[PDB]
Design a protein around this nucleic acid. Sequence first.
RNA 1: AAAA
Lengths: 155, 153
Amino acid sequence: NRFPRVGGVSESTVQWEGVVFTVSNESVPRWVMAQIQPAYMGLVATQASLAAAEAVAAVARRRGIEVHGPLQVADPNDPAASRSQVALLLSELRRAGCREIAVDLTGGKLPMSLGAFMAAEEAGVASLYVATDFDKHLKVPDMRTATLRQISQPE
Amino acid sequence: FPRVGGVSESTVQWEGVVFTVSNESVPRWVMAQIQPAYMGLVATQASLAAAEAVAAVARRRGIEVHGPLQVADPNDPAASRSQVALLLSELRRAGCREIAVDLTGGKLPMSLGAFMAAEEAGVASLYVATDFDKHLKVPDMRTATLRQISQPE
RNA sequence: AAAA
């Protein structure tokens, strides 16, 4: 694809046994999946992004990842609703044996990312972010500049 | 310390509002609804022209504008926390009694550092929520509402 | 994904 083949800023950034996503599009989580190569995955989506989350899930299961979800949030503008569902996925992954989890909060609306961040921080799990440079008018990310970054390490 | 809650629209005419800035359209819409007396702006080298456009309009309405202050690294929440925290202090010291932070604009880590600075200062966080087209890529500004992300205690 |  037009994402770089290599994306992690550092070796620790790509070492995770599980990853939980807030989902808006299927492209970015699919790329992060290929960067990290986890054994487990969780997905939080909305009614509007459900189809894209189900496509990330189908891809991941085919490669043998244990995928929990997608779970839906009733309201993507409510960070509490996303915190609840991310916290449930974090707990499900742990009861399934996943020893080290990070939450990629790039996707979804901003309150979804904020709920995910709070759930991650309260659970002692790191948060990841795909950073890109943009066009002049800051409306479109350049996939070819993507880098995966850790923005918290509260473990 | 402010608690992160549900869906309620923010209905306070905040005396001061601090923005993280990416585009000029959304802050201008916020400023038109809230009509604050004070405004702070946090931008980047890339979003500076937009932030200065917001500032020019606000100043011509009589609003006291602090900033734009620039973040060196928009991918790093701590750089944005620091500048938002500076502007919160600046507005309070300039006489502003009730402040909110609108974290809609900027990259996600700029919003996240803004949020942390708002939580630390005990002030509310706001978000402009809109509905999008079917592919979730173009927001429809006609549907904009101002949401209160957190509730200061 | 600098307003999913």
